[PDB]
Structure 1
Amino acid sequence: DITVYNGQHKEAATAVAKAFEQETGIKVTLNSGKSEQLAGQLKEEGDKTPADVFYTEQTATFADLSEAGLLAPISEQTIQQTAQKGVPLAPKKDWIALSGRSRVVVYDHTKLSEKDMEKSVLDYATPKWKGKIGYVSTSGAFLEQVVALSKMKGDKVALNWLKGLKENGKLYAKNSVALQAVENGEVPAALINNAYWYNLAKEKGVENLKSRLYFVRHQDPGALVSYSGAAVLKASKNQAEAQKFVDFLASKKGQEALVAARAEYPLRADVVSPFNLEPYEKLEAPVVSATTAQDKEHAIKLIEEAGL
């Protein structure tokens, strides 16, 4: 049996654990919390941690652990299971990317069509969109978007975008609220993540929704994908089962278990999501380095400078 420190949504961790326990008979115990806090705990616990595996919604959290010498190597054959073009790889082969979440633009298709959409996420923060573009400045993925803009385009461009959103956008407290505002005619479009819409569509039926999704693609900063993944702790003295679990997460059956539970993009190419997601390769995500705590502090400062 193994212990998994879990920073991912509980529904995802529960689903993969259940499918693992059914396939192998090995029991999984989840210790759930925020990834940053769990990573901190793995560092403090060191040689004495009870964690066999760390399962996170954000692979960026692995960098510090790898640097601290706390992660075990994984089989190269396992790593190759999800190594599609664009997928981040661990330089020391000591963690693996498993799934993705995408930025998107949700729009009311009864008011707008793809003719009204922009080729660049930068262009939504301009006067054409005055009073017509929703955004959620307190959202984690919104922060990741700012980080990506700074990296890809520089701070002046990132700051200008934020100022443009202050001037032209409508602020919503949460992604769900922004989605509902589009559905109810309050705003014709909003900057969001893919999962909300795909969940609502599966549950309600797309024919019963006024909103649709627009993907910018062509490696625009607005095509940003955030990656979830897993790692084995070097401290584990149950490497055999820990490695077996990570191998399983990258397997067809493990990926199928995840995508039935959560509207994330599988990184195996032979797995199809029942939420009707497009294949990962068609998103044309940009390549962006991992978000560090320093990147986050800098991005928060830009948000503050913009009056948000």
Structure 2
Amino acid sequence: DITVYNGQQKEAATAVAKAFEQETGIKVTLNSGKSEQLAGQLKEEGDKTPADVFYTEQTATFADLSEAGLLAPISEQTIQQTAQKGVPLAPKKDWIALSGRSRVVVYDHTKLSEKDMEKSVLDYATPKWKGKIGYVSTSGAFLEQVVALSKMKGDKVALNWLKGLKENGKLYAKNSVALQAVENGEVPAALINNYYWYNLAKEKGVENLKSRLYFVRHQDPGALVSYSGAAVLKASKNQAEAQKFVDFLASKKGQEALVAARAEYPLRADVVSPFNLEPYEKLEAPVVSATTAQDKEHAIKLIEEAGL
């Protein structure tokens, strides 16, 4: 049996842990928390950690741990199972990306069509979209988007985008609220993440929704994907089962379990999501370095400078 420090949404983690317990008979104990906190705890615990695996919604949180020498290598063969072009790879082969969440534009298809959409996320923050674009400045993925803009286009472009949203956008407290605002006709489009919409569509039926999704693609900053993943702790005294679990997560079966539980894009190329997601490769996500604490601090400063 293994102990998994879990920064991923509890529902997803519970699902893969059960499919694992069923393929193998090995019990998983999930210890859930925020990935940044869990990473801090793993670093502090060091060679005395009881964690076998760290399962996260954000592979960026592995960087501090890898840099501290706290992660074990994963089999090359396992890493390759999800190594689609675009997918972040651990330079030390000491963690693996497993699935992704995407930025997206949700829009009310009774008011806008795909031909009205902007091909760059930068262009939603402009006067064409005055009063017409929702955004969620407190959201984690919004912050990731700002970080990506700063990295890809520079801080001035990122700040200008934020000021453009301040002037032209409608602020919503949460992605779910923004999605409902589009559905209810309050705003014709909003910047959210994919999984809110796919969840709503799965539950209610797309035939009963006014909203649709527009993906900018072509490695635009707005095609940003945030990657979930897993790592084995170097200090684990149960390497064999820890590795078995990570191997399972990258297996067809483990990926099938994840995608049934949460509308993340699987990174295997032979798994289709019951949420009816497009294949990961079609997203054309940009390649962006991992978000650091420093990156986040800088992005928060830009949000404040923009008046948000």
TM-score range relative to shorter protein: over 0.9
CA offset at residue 257 of structure 1? 0.3
**How far does the alpha carbon of each residue in 1:222-248 deviate from its partner, in whole angstroms, 9 at most, with x for none?**
000000000000000100000000000
Q: Distance in 1 between matches of 2:220 and 2:47?
A: 42
Deviation at 1:212, TM superposition (A): 0.2
Distance in 2, matches of 1:184 and 1:77, equals 47
Tell me the SS of whatever aligns to 1:212.
Answer: strand
SS at match of 1:213: strand
Q: Deviations over 1:80-109 (max 9, x none)?
A: 000000000000000000000000000000
Q: Distance in 1 between matches of 2:143 and 2:268?
A: 27
- C-alpha RMSD of matched pairs (Å): 0.3
Separation in structure 2 between the aligned mates of residue 29 and residue 295 of structure 1, nearest angstrom? 32
After superposition, the C-alpha distances for 1:203-226 in whole angstroms (9 at most, x for unaligned) are 000000000000000000000000
Structure 1 segments, 4+ long, off by >3 Å, are: none
* Mapping of residues 16-55 of structure 1, within 5 Å: 16-55=16-55
Specify the SS of the correspondent of 2:228. strand
- Post-superposition shift, 1:270? 0.3
Q: What CA distance in whole angstroms lies between the structure 2 residues aligned with 1:185 and 1:244?
A: 48
CA distance in 2, matches of 1:215, 1:275: 16
Residue 187 of structure 1: CA displacement? Answer: 0.3
Unaligned residue ranges in structure 2 (runs of 5+):
none
Q: Secondary structure at 2:227's aligned position in 1? A: strand
Report Cα offsets for 1:11-51 as digits up to 9, x if no partner: 11000000000010000000000000000000010111000
SS at match of 2:253: helix
**Within 2, Cα distance between the matches of 1:171 and 1:191?**
10
Deviation at 1:146, TM superposition (A): 0.2
Work out the CA distance in 1 between the residues paired with 2:131 and 2:260.
37
Query: In structure 1, how many angstroms separate the alpha carbons of the residues matched to 2:31 and 2:114?
Result: 44
Q: Aligned-pair distance for 1:302?
A: 0.2
Q: Give distance in 1, aligned partners of 2:200 and 2:236.
A: 40
Return the alpha-carbon distance in structure 1 between the equivalents of residues 17 and 127 of structure 2: 48
Q: Give SS of 1:271's match.
A: coil
Quote how far apart the aligned CAs of 1:115 are.
1.1
Give me the whole-angstrom Cα distance separating, in 1, the residues matched to 2:47 and 2:121: 45
**TM-score normalised to the size of structure 1?**
1.00
Pairing 1:217-228 to 2, within 5 Å after superposition: 217-228=217-228
Cα offsets for 1:276-308 (capped at 9, x unmatched)? 000000000000000000000000000000000
Cα displacement (A) at 1:125 = 0.4
Alpha-carbon distance in structure 2 between the residues aligned to 1:285 and 1:35 = 23
- 1-structure distance, mates of 2:184, 2:203: 18
Task: Give the Å deviation of 1:256.
Answer: 0.2
Please give the alpha-carbon distance, in whole angstroms, between the structure 1 residues aligned to 2:229 and 2:196: 20
Partner Cα distance (2:255, 2:53) in 1: 17
| 1: CA distance, partners of 2:43 / 2:115 | 50
Instruction: Point out where structure 1 has 5 or more consecutive residues left out of the alignment.
Output: none
Q: Alignment identity in percent?
A: 99
Give the C-alpha shift of residue 119 in structure 1: 0.8
Q: Secondary structure at the match of 2:106?
A: strand
Partner of 1:176: helix, strand, or coil? helix
Tell me by how many angstroms 1:138 deviates.
Answer: 0.1
- Determine the C-alpha separation between the residues in 2 that align with 1:257 and 1:98: 12
- Find out whether 1:153 has 2:170 as its counterpart: no
TM-score under structure 2 normalisation?
Answer: 1.00
2:14 aligns with 14
